[PDB]
Amino acid sequence: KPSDLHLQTGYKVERHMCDGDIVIFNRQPTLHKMSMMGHRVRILPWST
Amino acid sequence: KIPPRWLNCPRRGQPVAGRFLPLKTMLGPRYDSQVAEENRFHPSMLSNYLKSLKVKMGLLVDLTNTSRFYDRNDIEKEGIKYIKLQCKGHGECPTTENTETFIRLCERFPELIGVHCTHGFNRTGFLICAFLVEKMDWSIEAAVATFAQARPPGIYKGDYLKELFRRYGDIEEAPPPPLLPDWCFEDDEGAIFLEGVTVKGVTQVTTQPKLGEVQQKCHQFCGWEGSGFPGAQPVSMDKQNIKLLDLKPYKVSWKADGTRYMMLIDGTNEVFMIDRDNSVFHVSNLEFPFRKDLRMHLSNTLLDGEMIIDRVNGQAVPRYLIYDIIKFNSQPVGDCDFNVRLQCIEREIISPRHEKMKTGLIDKTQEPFSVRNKPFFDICTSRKLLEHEMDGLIFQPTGKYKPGRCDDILKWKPPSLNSVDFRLKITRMGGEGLLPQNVGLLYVGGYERPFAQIKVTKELKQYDNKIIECKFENNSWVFMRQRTDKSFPNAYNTAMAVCNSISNPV
Amino acid sequence: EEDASQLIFPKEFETAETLLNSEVHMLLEHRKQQNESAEDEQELSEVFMKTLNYTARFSRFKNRETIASVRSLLLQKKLHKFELACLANLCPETAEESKALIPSLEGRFEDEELQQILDDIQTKRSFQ
Amino acid sequence: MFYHISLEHEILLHPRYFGPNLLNTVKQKLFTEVEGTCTGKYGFVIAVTTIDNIGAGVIQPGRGFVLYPVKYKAIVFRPFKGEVVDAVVTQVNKVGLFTEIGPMSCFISRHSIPSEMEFDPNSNPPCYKTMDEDIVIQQDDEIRLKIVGTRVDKNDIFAIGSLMDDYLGLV
Ligand SMILES: *O[C@H]1[C@@H](O)[C@H](n2cnc3c(=O)[nH]c(N)nc32)O[C@@H]1COP(=O)(O)OP(=O)(O)OP(=O)(O)O
Fold first, then answer.
1. Is the distance from CB of B93 to CB of B162 less than 8 angstroms?
2. Where is this region: TPase (chain B)?
3. Which of B38, B90, B320, C91 has a C-alpha 20 to 30 A away from that of B295?
C-alpha cells in the first residue's frame, strides 16, 4: 500500500545501481592485483 | 438479512473469573468521520486504561473474522499478542473445533485475556463459558450467570445458551434468552442542547414514537432522500471564488460561531429543534402565532438557523437566529427566492410574535430563548463588513433552497485556530538513536505511522495514549483540552482536510 | 553463596563503599535540584522518587556536619564499611541489640566499648 | 546497603546525535540509560554520582555509531541475605506481608512470622497484632526485617524478610 512508502532520515533503500557506481571487475586466474580492479558503472543497452 | 448495532454498547465488561476481559470490537481511527467522543472505542484507550491501572493484558482474541475494524499493530506494539480466531459463520455457534482452538490458545498466556467480537456478548460469552467449564471446572450455570452479570446484558441468543447447556449440562434446563434493553433495541430507524449554557424549557426528545415522527416530517419538508440531518451544508471556500459568490446575487451575512438548528413548528406546544446529529429537542413556551389570526398558532412550518450565545455582561443569553425558512403552513416557501423567504421570515414569523410582545399576551422573560432573524446584505457591502461577534462571513446564493451539500453556499470564516484530534502515544527512544529524547507521537485515522510530533511536557504525560485536543499555532500542535471520553484521533482524511484549511485558509 | 551475617560478599562487592541514609537523601535531593534547573530534561525514574522519599522518611542525621562527625567517629573504629553503615543506619541502643541485629560484631569490639559507641550514636542522632 | 561505587558502561552515539556539544549528549545518554535500572550483580542502580572518565571513541568498522566506554561514580543499592533493614509496610495479608525498602517490594510470609503476631481483618485496617495488642504492625508503619534472602531476578532483587529472630518487628 502507498502508506508505508514514506521516507524519513534513517531509512535504507536498496536501489538499482545507476551510472557512477563502483564495482569490482575481475577475471579468474587472479595471479596479480591488476587482475581485479574497480570500475565505474555505465549503463549501456545490450547484455554484455 | 437482519441487523446488528454498535454505538450504544459499553466498551467493556467486568473481568470474568479474574482472567477474561470481555470487550466490544475496537474500531480504527479510519471511522472517526462517523463517530466521536460518546461512541469512539479505540485500541489506545484499552491499552491505556490498562496502563493507568498498572495491568498487562497478555493476549487479545479477535472473533470478528475481519480486519476492517482496527489495526492489529496498535495492539502488538504494546507487547500484547494478537490472535484472529476464525469462528463458524452463518449465525451459527462456534464449533467444538473453535472451542478447542480457543482453549488451546488461552491456556498459554497475573495478566488479563481480552476477548472481543463485534459486540462482545454472544461469541465472546460462549467461548469464555466453554473455557470456564473445561479449563476451570465451573458449572455451566455459574459461567452463564457470571457472564450475564459481568457483561451487563450477557449472552442473548437462545440457540447459544441451548448449545452451551447441551454440551456442558442439561439442555432442558437451558434458560431462555434475557429480555434485552428495550432502550437499546432502538437505533434501528448530542445530548447537550447548547454547549456551555443551561437552557430552560428545552428538553431532549428520546420518546420513540414522536422522535421518528419529527425526523420524518423534517425529511419530507426538505425532500431529503437519504437518512440524517436534511439541512443545507455550506462548504469550504478557498480558491478564485468570490466572483462565484457574486454570480447569483448572493447575499452576505456575518457568521457568528453557533450551533446549527432547524426548528419545526408543528402545532400548539409542538416546537422542536434539530441539530446536525438529528437529535430532537422539545421547546415548551415558544409561541408562533398566525399572522392573520393572532389567536391561532402555526403548523407545518420548518425553519433553519443557528443558536448563538450573546453576552449581556455577567450572564450569557441564548439567541436563535433564523437565517432561512423551508416551509410555511405547508406552502413550499423554500422553492421561492431567497429574498422572498427572508421577507417570509420577517413578515410571517417575527412580526406576529412581535405584535403580542407589545400587548402583554406574550412575555419574553418567560420564553426559553430570544428569537431573531439574521440580516443579509449585498456583497458590495460585504467589502465594508471586511473594513453578535462574527468568526466569519456566510455567502448565500439567491436561488431556491437545496438540502445536503451545497457547493454554492460558501463559508468565509477567519481561522487561525485549527485543532485536530490526535492519539498521543509517548515513546522514549531506545534502539538505533538511543537518546533521552522522549517525544510524544500523534496519530490519525487509517494512517499507521504517526501523523505529527508534539513536545513532551510535565502536564502532557497525564493523558498518554489518550485523546488530547491540539490546536495548531506557531508551527506546532498545541494541547488545549483532553477530549475526555473520545478514544483516539480524527481520521487521516479529516486531519488532512484540517491541514489543507490551515495552510490555505479562508 | 552470600551472607551478610558473616560479611560474605561477592568479589564485585569488595570495593563497595557504603553510604548513609542521610547522605543518600542529601545527594538525591541535590540531583532533584539539578533536575529542577537545566531544563529540556525530563523527570527521573520511579526508582529515584521511591528511594528519595524512602530515605527521607528514615533519615536520622539532619545535618551534613552530623554526617561528617559520625563518619569521623566511626571511621577511626576498626569496623568494616558494611558494619559501620548498618550501625549508623539502624542505630541500636543496647549492645545486645547491636550484636543481635549485626551478628558479625561478635567480639569485634568490647561490649562496653560497643555501648560507648552506641551512646555516641544516640548523642549524635538528630532528634525530631 | 546504599553503595557509592564506580561502574563502567559503554554508550553508542550515532552521527545524527553528535551536535556541537558532544560530551553533554553522552552525559545525558548515561543519565538516561542506567538511572533507575537494576542488575543482578550490582543491584538497584539508584543514580549516577559523577561521570569520571570518558574513554576514547572507537568507530566500529562497518557501523556508523561511535562507542564510548564511560566510568562513573554511582549510588546503588543491593539487598543482602541476613541484613536487618528498616522498611515501610504497604499491605498486611493473611498469607504474608507487603513491605517496601526503597523501590524494592519485600514479601514476608506469615509462616516465617512468629505465632504471637496473628493476622486480623476485623480491625478497620487489616493488620498484624498480638493478643496483648502491644505490637501493632499495620499499613504505613516503620518496621525492621532481617532479610531471609532476595529473589535476584531480571531488573528485580525483591527480598524476603524475617521476623523470627530477636528484636524484629515494630520500631
Ligand atoms: O482481502 C479482503 C478483500 O480483498 C475482500 N473484500 C472485502 N470486501 C470486498 C468487496 O466488497 N469487494 C471485493 N472485490 N473484495 C472484497 O475480502 C478480503 C477479506 O475478507 P474478510 O474476511 O475480511 O471479509 P469480512 O469478514 O470483513 O466481511 P464482514 O464479516 O465484516 O461482513
1. no
2. 1-189
3. B320
Q: List the binding residues of B.
A: 260, 276, 304-306, 411-413, 481-486
| Closest CA relative to residue B71, chosen from B102, B30, B119, B34 | B30
* Residue type, position B214, single letter: V
Query: Does the beta-carbon distance from C20 to D2 stay under 8 Å?
Result: yes
User: Nearest CA to CA, how far is B489 from chain A (Å)?
Assistant: 18
User: Which numeric CATH code is attached to D81-171?
Assistant: 2.40.50.140
Four-way CATH pick for B20-168: 3.90.190.10, 3.30.70.270, 3.30.70.1730, 3.40.50.150: 3.90.190.10
Q: How many residues does chain B have?
A: 506
Task: Indicate the CATH number for domain C1-126.
Answer: 1.20.1250.40
- Residue D122: Cβ within 10 Å count: 7
D12 at interface of B, judged by CB pairs closer than 8 A: yes
Which chains contact D through at least 3 pairs of Cβ atoms less than 8 Å apart?
A: B, C
| B22 and B128 Cβ atoms separated by less than 8 Å | yes
Query: For residue C41, which residues of chain B lie inside 8 Å, CB to CB?
Result: 436
Cell numbers 514476608: residue? D108
C-beta atoms of B436 and D29 within 8 A: yes
- Ligand 1 pocket list (CB less than 6 A): B 65-68
Protein residue closest via CA to atom 27 of ligand 1:
B66
- What is the chain D residue with the closest CA to B435? D29
Q: How was this structure determined?
A: cryo-EM
Query: How far is ligand 1, taken at its centre, from the CA of residue B68, in Å?
Result: 8
Q: Is B436 near chain C, with CB under 8 Å?
A: yes
Report d(CA C104, CA C7) in Å as an integer.
7
Q: Which residues of D touch B435 (CB under 8 A)?
A: 17, 25, 28-29, 32
Dist. CA B348–CA B302, nearest whole Å: 12
D137 touches chain C (CB under 8 A): no
In this structure, are strands B59-62 and D66-77 parallel, antiparallel, or unpaired?
Answer: unpaired
D27: which residues sit within 8 A by CB, 6+ positions away?
Answer: D51
From chain D, the residues in CB contact with B434 under 8 A are 12, 29, 32-33
Atom of ligand 1 nearest to the CA of B89: 30
Cα angle, residue B375 at apex, residues B371 and B377 outer, rounded to 5°:
170
| Domain definitions of chain C by residue range | 1-126
Contact criterion met (CB < 8 Å) for B458 and C41: no
CB atoms within 10 A of CB B324: 23
Instruction: For residue B65, count CB atoms less than 10 angstroms from its CB and return exposed for 0-12, middle for 13-18, buried for 19 or more.
Output: middle
Resolution in Å equals: 3.9
Element (H, E) at A38: strand A36-40
Burial class, D91, CB count within 10 angstroms (exposed 0-12 / middle 13-18 / buried 19+): middle
CATH 3.30.1490.120 in chain D, residue ranges: 1-80
- Point out the residues of B that are catalytic: 117, 255
In CATH terms, the fold of domain D1-80 is: Dna Ligase; domain 1 (3.30.1490)
